[PDB]
Structures are given as structure tokens and as C-alpha cells.
Amino acid sequence: ASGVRIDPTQTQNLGVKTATVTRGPLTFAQSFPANVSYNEYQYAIVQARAAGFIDKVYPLTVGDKVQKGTPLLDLTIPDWVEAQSEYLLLRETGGTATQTEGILERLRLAGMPEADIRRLIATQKIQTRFTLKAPIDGVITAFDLRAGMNIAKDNVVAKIQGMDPVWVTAAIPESIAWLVKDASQFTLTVPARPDKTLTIRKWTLLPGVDAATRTLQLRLEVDNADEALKPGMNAWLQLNTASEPMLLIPSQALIDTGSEQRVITVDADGRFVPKRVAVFQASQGVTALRSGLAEGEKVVSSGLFLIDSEANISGALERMRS
């Protein structure tokens, strides 16, 4: 028989770090893994406008960089022989302006380039030996045709991808999306050339996130006159920016079990009392919160109060009340 009572709810009065919640920004500092490649808007695949046979192939090959108008190969297109003859004859015996303008345009449709047409009108000699020239200056990345061989309409005579304004794509992790959505300035830097560190201010963020790594893409239309920064170099895209000022507390003060997450706060006096809270995203050791606490309140700085070995987070917390 003993009426002496006591308080069951566990108490702490020697070893408590009180941290105060603050309306502040999230400080990010991340350099991203990026690399360069040919400007895909400068993409040219030259193939024969019609069937034929190849006479000579010019001293080019994959890897070599060509300049526009560069002789690629000399081929024989026999397809338009009969078609040009109709023209040549119509010129030899009158032929009306409409008659010629016709045959000569049905010839453009037949395939023969307006250029090879002109060199026909002039020479008057039918055109059988044509020559392919590189449409744009860039790096040859394909060459399906070599001498002593025939040619068809699908054979790729040469793929030539430019790089005057060299491209570069970086890989930012899915998680950061909400921040990079609106970004100010990325500071690009490639190992190859440390002297060419361009302050990047404009870019585009592709809508796809390479599922293989879960990183969203973004390119940079950067200049390349000296063509010194070549396609195939591991580049780095640095970053550092604040956020939409949102109330935040030290991550260490967040008791985060799977699903429901919580934090424990000290009232006006000293007693403990937990509060269910939604988390936004962490950064540099501090977590941002969506709702659950008002700025100013005092949260306990450590979730080091629940014994490990699977001591019920749910359970141990309910002991701190009633």
C-alpha cells in the first residue's frame, strides 16, 4: 500500500541540443558530369541522287575533317542519259520555251542537281561523270564507298558532322529537377583545355531523363573557332545557387522512418512533444520542409534518443506524450 505517484513519460534534463527552425534558402554546390559531341544541327549525310558506278574515290576517310565543297568521289550516273538527250535534241531543232522549261525541269525531278544541269546547258555534252562535294564543313564519320565498287541510292557516301559551334551535354540527377528548372548561370570547365573556361548563361533542358542513370540532359551551344575543344571530351558543368526561401531545420533533427516522417519539439518550458511533418529536400546537411512547423519554434537537434536494434520509431515516440 503506497500512494506515492510518479510520471511514466520519460524525461530528459541533461544532454539536449535545441535547434531553432529558420526561414532560409537551400545552398547547393554541385559540379556535373558532361561531355562534348558534334553539333547535331550541323548534320549532313551525302548519298547518290541515283544508281550508278564509282570511278575514283578521293583521299578521305572516317576521322578526317573536310571543308565544304570538298571532292568526295567521282561516279557515273547513267540514269539521265536518255533524259538529257531529249533536251539536247529539242535545242538542236527549235523547241519552245515551254518545251525546254519542261524537259529541263522533269530532269530536276529525275534527280539531277540544278548544278549539274547548268554544267549541261553550257557544255551541251551529255552528263555522265558527276562529282560529289561535301555539303558542309565538318568531321567525316562515315564512308560506305571505296573505289572499284558500284553505288546505290541508299549507300551512304559520307556522313559529315560539323562542330563549329561544338555541342556539350551534361547530366544532372533527377532529384535536383525542381531547382534546375529555373537556373541562372552554369560554369562550364573541361580538362582538355583549362584556359577555355566559358561562363555559360544560356542553355536548354531536354525533356528526357536518361533512365540508365536517372539524370536529365541539357546542351550548350558553345563557340569553337580554334576547333580546339574536340567532340569526345569529358567536360564538367559546375553549379551553385540558393532556393525558394523555405523554412528549414537540421537534417539530424528529423526522425525519418519509411513512409511517415517526424520531428520532436521542445515546448515553451522543456517537455518534449513530436509532430508529423512533410519533407521537401535536403542539402548540405540541412533539410527543407513543406509544412508541419512554423518558423521560430524549437526542435530537438538529434534523433539519437531511440535505441537502435529496431526500437519502434512509432512506439518510442508515443511514449513521449500522455
Binding site: 544532454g15 558530369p33 542513370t213 531511440l306 535505441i307
Partner: protein, 1028 residues
Amino acid sequence: WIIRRSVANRFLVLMGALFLSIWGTWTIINTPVDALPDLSDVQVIIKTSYPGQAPQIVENQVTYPLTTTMLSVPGAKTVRGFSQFGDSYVYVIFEDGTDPYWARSRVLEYLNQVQGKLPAGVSAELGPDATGVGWIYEYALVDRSGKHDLADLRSLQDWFLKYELKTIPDVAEVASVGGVVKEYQVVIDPQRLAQYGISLAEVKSALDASNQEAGGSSIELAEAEYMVRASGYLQTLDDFNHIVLKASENGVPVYLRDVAKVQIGPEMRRGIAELNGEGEVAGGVVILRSGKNAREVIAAVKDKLETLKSSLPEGVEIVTTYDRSQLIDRAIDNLSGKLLEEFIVVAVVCALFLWHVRSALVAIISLPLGLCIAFIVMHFQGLNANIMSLGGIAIAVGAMVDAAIVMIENAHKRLEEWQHQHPDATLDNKTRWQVITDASVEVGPALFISLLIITLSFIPIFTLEGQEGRLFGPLAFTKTYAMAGAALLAIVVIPILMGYWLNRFLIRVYHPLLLKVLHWPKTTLLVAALSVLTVLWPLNKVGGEFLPQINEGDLLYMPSTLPGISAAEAASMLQKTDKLIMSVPEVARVFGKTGKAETATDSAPLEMVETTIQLKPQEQWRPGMTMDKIIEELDNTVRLPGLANLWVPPIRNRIDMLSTGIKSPIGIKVSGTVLADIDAMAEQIEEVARTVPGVASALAERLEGGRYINVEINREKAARYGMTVADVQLFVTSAVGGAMVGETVEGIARYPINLRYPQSWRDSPQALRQLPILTPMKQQITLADVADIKVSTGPSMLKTENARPTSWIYIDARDRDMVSVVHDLQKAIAEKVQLKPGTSVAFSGQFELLERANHKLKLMVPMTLMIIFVLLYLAFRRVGEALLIISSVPFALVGGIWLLWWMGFHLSVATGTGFIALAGVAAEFGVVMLMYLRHAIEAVPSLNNPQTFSEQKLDEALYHGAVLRVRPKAMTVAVIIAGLLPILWGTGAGSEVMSRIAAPMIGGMITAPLLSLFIIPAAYKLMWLHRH
């Protein structure tokens, strides 16, 4: 005999005496001061941490074969067995005469063998050179400033204190108790594992290699050594966040940050520690080695703490929780007081009968030098001793007088008889020199040998085994020091001092009484036999006890509950009961700790919790509250359902736990070969151990009540997804569980780095059923797909004493006597508890120590006689007288009992030694009887008589023997009794046991003299009537 020479040499004894003084005054200053006899048996321990699998197999292979491999190697008293889930503790305890360290070395050979068997990363760690009794000075780190917390204090104690202390010589190991281990946790979201297509094992195998430094050879530049290093050790958080898991040609890598969040949390806690029923803190505990000095180390600690009471960071504060100094010094400041009260009382007794001040000084001097001649050899002894030595000289100093006084009294009378003829005018040197020396040669061999008799008749006690052996042994060799030292000193002192410088009504009452005892003497001898039957009745119903429950400046609390309680709960009930203890207004602090601390010594189940409870100064308690009285306001206050309560002294507690286990004053064992059988036949022993009004509370421990959540893995279901058992188990150890993988070596310190899913996927069995697992073939099934998991109940903590299963039952009873409570139990235990085929009901604990003690005493009384009986044929020669003294003794003991009953004591072992003592002095006082009876007769009056028979001459010589005794008797029976009275009362720090031994002496030493005043004298005549 060899006394004539003692007188001859004067300057040597004088010089020697001063030599003893300077030495003695420098030995009481050159000696180690301890608190109590360390009953610590030579114990060897072997802590093994077989991963964290299960108790059963821990007992079958990492334990059982270990317990028996050591039984081979000799010395062991008993092989113990602790098989705790996660930790395997094995004990071999050596006893009695065994070299403490030889034990270790001889054990060590087996060790390396088992080390190879253990899994990787685990060692058998040899036990602390000390014992549980190393329990010396404990302290908790508190910070009500918030500047720090437990995690900060634990790291503050394991990387600072524990180190600034371990170097203190003789300290053995410093253990850390209660706290939070900074543990780098990585919470893997099983979903991101499936999304990024990374196997759990891939994470670990990646993590494993992501932390380590690599060195490089000395490259030569500028003709000087250049040593190349390689950044590796994890330090920043990102270093964890940036563990490489995979990467494509693209250059885009997959780190760890995107597979899991890495939070820093607490490690699986071993045992909790709490303070003042409000809050929990980091704790430290020093552990004195072997039987080294307890005080020396303690004090050596304090100033070292003061050296740090400034080097400590703002906020922290070292609040002590338990210190033996507050006891040892409380037990010494009491014994010093007794030794003083003795001296002065012996100085006021000598001045009562003896008139001169000069003559009273001889009784004095015999004491200080008696101490000097004691301490001298005390420091030479090899086994160390302890406090007991002080209580011994308290009984030795008393004997000093009996050897001092009888001889000095023989001087006052030998001078008187020389004055009846000589004038009182010229006290020349020649006349004042023969009278003195004459008194010394008479009593010389007459009493000198007598002491050799009393000491030897007390010798057997030295033969006591182990604990009680080196316990009462001290008080045994101490008596010898002063006493037997006086037989060489006090004899040569009194004469030197005597030669360098209401008393009528006292001898009245006595003499007229002898007229009746010499009348029909045969019957007076017969009435003595009457007394024995009146002493038999007082015997019974006082039970007894191994030893008085010596109450100390604190007390340990032991609550035992059913099998397996969750650490969360078993740390809440603890922090609860603490709040309760603080309710009483006499308790100072309350350092409550459940479960083991960081020491191979304390092996405590979370089930129970040993809390240190320091109570306020006795000069501050409530008006009407004593130890036994406060305990009640505790056992009836601190009350929780299903929690059986028990209270015990902390020191006595530890020792019993180490020596035989138990340490609930009463212990009941039960050997088992069937797990279910043992607990069964042991369970009912608890429900009948309460049916006794003498018992307060009791708790019977079950051997198998642990609850399991089995995961019976299915091989066939596994291959379906192409997983070997190993593969799926990975998800049980560091996915559902959370075993370590590595450590963040932070300079001086290191912390663990565990790995698992968040708690959600491991809430309940159902959670483990839906536990998401990622196959090696990138399929994503659930743990239920490769195994069925069911909950069951089995072994919780396998215990194997003698490598053979045996359980104990704890019982509390401090409101009765420790004999009627252990007897009634033994009576009922076999009245309605029918025995199963396999069981061994062994009453252990404080009663097992009782059996041994009483066997030594019963084997001490017969062989007391042989030394006693033979030494009667040496000094007296007479054969009949020997049969008179050996039959004289039983009456002295007869009285000793009656005092215990009245005052209110119990039959203890401390009392028994005192009882042996009573005979020894009563055997000496019976000798100074036969002497005056064999001297007076042959001196002058009788010789003309014995030729025939007569009644007048016999009447006169007996009236003379009565006078020649009164003075020596009175003095003797005065000093000793007056000296026994202080300790008699019983109150004081530790005095509870020092009085238990002395009390028996008084009563028996009061009936002995009176019975040697009439009986022994009027008993010689009959034997004379036989030599005719």
C-alpha cells in the same frame, strides 16, 4: 626458563624498544589501507562475439567445446557458461590456492585455436586482469547546458576519459557504460535499388572498398625521402554520398546518394545507463586489478579528474556515482575510534584496581609498542590482508593486558612480602632489583607458554578455504602479533617500567561464597552440568547466517523479470523505477544501468538492471529511519507489475555473482538435460518460495522464453530466381537487420557504419513478408517468395555450468534470518515438487558458503583439543588436570550463547571464531588457576598435610588461591570485558560484523571466570584423592 636472559640484557631491549617505536610509528604510516576482504577468486574470462545469429549454435560450438577444453587444464573450481545472443561469455573460475596469472597463461594456449574458428572480424578477448570486485569508482557525464549530448559524451568518454585513466597504474581496464555510439547509418530505399538496377550485395561490395588509405614507396627527389600517400579514409558526408556503384561509357556515374540517404544515428545499444530518475547520460567505471589497493587508485583518480576539470569543454560535468573511499575511510575512522576507546578503557581499568600511575603505565606501554610489533610483520605478510587486521588487533590488545597484568600483579605482592620483614627506610639499588626480577621468572614460563597455547588453539581458522579463509585469517594472525608478541615484550616491559619509577568492598562478597562451594564440592560440579541443558533451548530459533549483512554507504538494486524484454521498454521501466527511488528523502543519487557495460566483466541481460543507489549521510536521514527501515520504504515503493524486487549490498552482490553466480542472497539451482524439463521443475519452486512469511520477494528465471521470428529459407524457391542461400540471407543480416560493414577511422577514434532498409520494411512479420528483394537477375520479388517466415519461442540465454545445463532462482529476504529462510525453503521444496528424471536441486549462493564454513568449524573443535590436550601434559604434567581443563571449557562456551540471544544476534561464522576465542582465554584463566593451586600448596602451608588427609589445611590453601586470583582475575575480566563493550553495541560503519564476532566473547568470558572461581578450584581436590 628463557626469561632469565630477557632480564639480563637490558640496553638491547630498551634500544630495540625505541627501534620498534620509530618503526611502528612509521609502519602505521607505511601500510596499504583497504576496505574489506576481497573474496575474489582467481577468475578467467573469455568474451566472444559470434556475429549476431542465435543463442543455440552459440552454445553448441563457440561455447560448449570451449568450456570443456579448459576443464582439462587444472585449477578450476567451476566452469561457467554464458551464451547470450550476440555475445558468448565463458568462465573458468579458479579457487583457493592457485597462482592468478599462471591460470591465465595456462588458459591462453587454447585461445589462439578458437580465434581461427570465429568468423572474420571477431576475437575472443581475454578478460580484465581484475574481477567484478574491481567495481571501484563510477561516474556519469552530464551536460545540462545542451552544448553537448550523449553521442558527444560517449565519444568524449571512449576517446578521452577511458584513455586518460587506463594509464593510472594498477587500474586494469576502464569500462564505458550507457551512451550512444556514433554510427554512420545508410538507409537504402529498396525501390531505388530496383530503379537503378543495383543489387544489395553490389552496394556493400562497393562500399567495402570505398574506405581505406594506400601508401607508396619513398621516391627520390633532392636526395631526400618522399613518401607518397593516397586519399581514401571517409571523412565528409559526401564521401559516403559519392560511393561509386556503376557508370556507362557516357561518363554518367551512379553514386550512392541516389540509392540511399546516409544519416548518422545510434548503434544497437548494449546496456542503458540513467541518472537521478531524470535523463540518461554517458558513464564510466574504473576497475581495480586483482587484489591491489582500492584506496590508492581511487585517490590517484581524483586529482587526475581535477587535472581534467579544466581541459573539459564548456557544459560537461563529471558527477560521481559511486566511490569506495566514502566507505573504506568510514570503516577505518570507526576502527581507529575503537582502538582508542579500548586503550583509554584499559587505562582506566588498570587505575581502578592498581593504585599507582607509574604502575598503570606498564599496561599502557604494552599497547603502543604492541602495535609497533604488530604493524611490523603485517607489512611483511605476503597475502596483503585488509581491514580485518584492524579488528584483529582490537581483540589482540585485550589479550595484551592479561599477559601484562598477571605478571605485574605478581610484582606488587612479591614486594609486599619482602617488606613485612624489611624496614621502609632504605630503598637501596640492590634491594630494589631482586624483588622485580623475581616476579618475572615466576610468571615467565607459566604464562608465556600459555599464549603459545591460546594462539595455536586458534590456528585452525587459518585453514579456512578461499573467501572466508583470507577473511578471518587476517583477524587470526593479528591476535598473534600483539598477544604472542607480548609474551616476549610485555614480559620484559613491565619489570623495566616498575623498576624505573572502593577497594575494600571489592574482595568482600567473593570469599564468603567459597565457603559453600568447598562444602559438598561434588554437587557444585554437578550443577554446572545443569547449565548446559538451559543453554540448548536458547540455541534453536536463532538460526544463523554466513555473515552479517554489512550495510554500506549505498546499496545495489536488482529487479528480475520474465525472459526477453525489448531494450526500449527495459530502459523505460528502468528510468521509471529511478524516479521512484528519488521519492524517498534519504537517497542522494541513483545511477541506474541495465544490460552489460563495455567490459568483459559485467554480463547483464536487459531483463534486469543493477542500479547504484547512494544514500544521504546518516546525519541527514529521517528521524526514525535505519538501513533495514529505509529498504522497506523502497521495496514497497518502487513497485512495478511483473517486476520481482530485490535489494542487496553492492559489494557483496558483485562477489557472489562472480564466485558462484546468483547473488540473490538465497540461491536455488537445477541441473537440466531437457530444456523444457529444467525450467518446469524450477518454476514451481518459485510459487512455494513465496508461501513463507520470512521471504519478501522472489524471481525464478526461465531458460527458454525468448521469442523468435524465424525465416525458414526455401532452397527450391530460391533457385527459381537463381539465389543460393547465402544470397538471400544477405537481406536478413544487413537489410532487415543492420550488421556493420566498416569503420570511419577518425584519427584517434573509430565509429561503425551499418547498412539496411528504413525501419518501415521491417515493422512486423508482415513487413518481412512484403520485404522487397532484388534478384541477381534484376527481378523484383518479395522475401516471402523465397521463404516462409513464422514466429516461435525458444532459448533466450543458454546457461551451462560444468558444461551441463543448470539454472538458478533468485530470492529476497531481509526481514528474517538467513537460516530459517533457507531451511523452510529446503523443507517445502521437497513437499509438493516431485522430481523429473533429470535434475540437481543445489541450494547455492550465501548458503553454499555456509556449508563449507560449518564443516571447518566442526573439524576445528576436535583438533582444538589435541593441541589443547597435549599442551596440558607439557606445562602441568598431570594427566587428571588435563581432563579437568578439557571439561572446563564447555562451560565457558555455554555462556557465550546467552549474550547473543539477549542482545539479539544470529549464529554467524564471525561469531564462531569469537567462540573459539572464548575457550582460549578461558583456558588461560583456568591455567592461572591450576598454577596458584599447585604453587600455594607446595609453597609453605600444605606439604605437611598431603602425607595424610586433612580438612583445615585444605581450607586455608583454597582461601589463599581465591585471594591470589581476585586481583589478576578482576584485572583480566575487567580490561577484556570493558574492552569488548564498545564493539558490543553494534552501530557504526561496518561495525555490524566486527561486533558479531566480539559479542559471543563477552557472555562466555563472564561465565568462564565465575565458573573458574568456584568450579576449577573445587574440582582439583577430587583428582588429588586419586593419587593416593
